[PDB]
Homo-oligomer: A and B are copies of this chain.
Amino acid sequence: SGMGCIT
Protein backbone atom coordinates (compact mmCIF):
# COMPACT_ATOMS: atom_id res chain seq x y z
CA SER A 1 0.00 0.00 0.00
CA GLY A 2 2.69 2.43 -1.25
CA MET A 3 2.76 5.64 -3.37
CA GLY A 4 5.70 7.53 -4.85
CA CYS A 5 5.93 10.95 -6.57
CA ILE A 6 9.11 12.22 -8.25
CA THR A 7 7.93 15.81 -9.06
Contacts and interface: CB of A to CB of B under 8 A. Distances in A.
Interface of A: 1-7
Contacts of A1: 1-2
Copies in the complex: 10
Contacts of A7: 5-7
Contacts of A4: 2-5
A3 B5 CA distance: 8
A5 to B, nearest CB: 4
Given A5-B5, A7-B7, 6 more contacts: A2-B2, A2-B3, A3-B4, A4-B5, A5-B7, A6-B6
A5 B2 contact: no
Contacts of A5: 4-7
